[PDB]
Amino acid sequence: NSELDRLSKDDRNWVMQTKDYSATHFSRLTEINSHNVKNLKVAWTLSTGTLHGHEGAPLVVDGIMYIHTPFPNNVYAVDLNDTRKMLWQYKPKQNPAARAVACCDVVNRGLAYVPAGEHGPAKIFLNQLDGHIVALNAKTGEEIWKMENSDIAMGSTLTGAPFVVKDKVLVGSAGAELGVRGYVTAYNIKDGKQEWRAYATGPDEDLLLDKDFNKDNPHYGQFGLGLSTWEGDAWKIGGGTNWGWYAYDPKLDMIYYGSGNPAPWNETMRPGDNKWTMTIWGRDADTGRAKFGYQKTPHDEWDYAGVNYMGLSEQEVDGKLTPLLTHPDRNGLVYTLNRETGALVNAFKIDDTVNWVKKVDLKTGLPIRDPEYSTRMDHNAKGICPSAMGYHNQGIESYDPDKKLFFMGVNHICMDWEPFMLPYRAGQFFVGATLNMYPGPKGMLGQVKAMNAVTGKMEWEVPEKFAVWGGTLATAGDLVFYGTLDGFIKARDTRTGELKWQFQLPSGVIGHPITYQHNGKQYIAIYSGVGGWPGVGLVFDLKDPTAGLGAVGAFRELAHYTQMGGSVFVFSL
Amino acid sequence: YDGTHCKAPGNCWEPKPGYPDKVAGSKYDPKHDPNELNKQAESIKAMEARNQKRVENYAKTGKFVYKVEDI
Ligand SMILES: O=C(O)c1cc(C(=O)O)c2c(n1)C(=O)C(=O)c1cc(C(=O)O)[nH]c1-2
């Protein structure tokens, strides 16, 4: 959408979760900078009126902030000239049974926005846990249209944010832990008409492939693989949901995202590469047809769900300025691909303790597996890094184009894993592994790191008490801001990693910070309200260390630092 | 199984030592019920058909109506 692209370039706005179509999470605002951030104070605050995990962050467009909640996914609008009043509210009525089929807390990664055009007035888009995509009038909150994407009776929900491209809004999927076969869907913004729908497994017509799919890298695989890399009909329940983030290149007219893990977690029940789960896709915008598809983790054994964000940039590769995507996967590798051809540029370890894979062979594109850290029936596999939580999860990260550095919140969590046999029944969980998780070999649970994604050179690295889950915001003031699970927002100097400022929020953070200018002043805003996968223990009062899909034991100390909450904090000088 | 021995481009899977090429008939046979397997796709077809009713009513009347029994 060229008007949405243009609004994204205006520092008064934050028009999508990812900030802009490249997912830079980078602001040119410098009012707040490394030399005065120690003076940042809370300006004003809002309550969301809910508990549970608060993922994503607010949108700001044309002087209005938009807020969203975890289930039941209430939305409200606030005029930045009258911060105490809610301009409008939208309160979904959803079946409470939706909560029982969410694997990982009833999180929602937030709203999307499109400006007014031929399709009608400006709209806010919401994905509901119960599987509906809703279009609201951005100025009034009136419901314009609503469609069914996902059915909770099959264990299929929505948690990832909608994504607007031209006249379409894209809606993902969720429920691979209940055997949902992933799919992404484009709806027309005017009337909610389904334009196209691309599945992650199965026959080529379902995958929606360009006739020249992987023409540039035929060694990745081309046709027939969504059937031939599974035994029989096991693809029909085979995972590959896409509950993460998108990017878009308007010049190529290509949309990028990752498909998630194959189901079940029990690898022995699903022999084969299990394509095209765990895949980096480049899809034509109008048709949805994939131009490239790179499977990062063939035959996943670890739930490295391949949904993490895609950060676009233009950097020199062997001296030639090249359009790129960069993608810190769950599997602990940072992928950088040519975003036109899909060619692999690099795949480096985000922390050197990654052990499921020895290295990626860049020429073949294959990860060279270490069988010592495989999983398999009738075996308790020990000391696998990363754990299923990944060395990176759902947080959107940030890129400073002057430094050519990505700044990432990183997890340092490893695991033991033993699968088990179990039947598939639609609507029930379909996991089939028992896990124990714990800190990686360096002994803490999180890090923040700065890196060059072409060379792999780590600029700086610093430890954090807990996994850094919510992502980052970087600015031209030489700062990276992020929130922590234990309930801080913090700012570090992006040259050195030095900590410049910290503030104690009410609850842990699982979303990202934003910044915007309003009436000549810079603000930083963030949600506070712990939850998501790390918070399942505290949110659901769980005690068995293998409960919450194995996260309970690793995060057992988090409840000593934070309770649940739900608030928006806005800071300024 | 180190992931580098490929039967075909995009297809590198091997069984691990001592495990079967095919699971059907093995001790690891998932024995999925084909009727259970098909339920998701049936549910999608039903959602798609309702959505298409809502779209058609919008194009006919100019007013959006969610509940398909009210159209
Ligand atoms: O396979 C799925 O469809 C699915 C969905 C979700 C979800 O909807 O949030 C998560 C996961 N998987 C998962 O693998 C995971 O690590 C996870 C963490 C979180 C969270 O918000 O903290 N959700 C999810």
Ligand SMILES: [Ca+2]
């Ligand atoms: Ca998963």
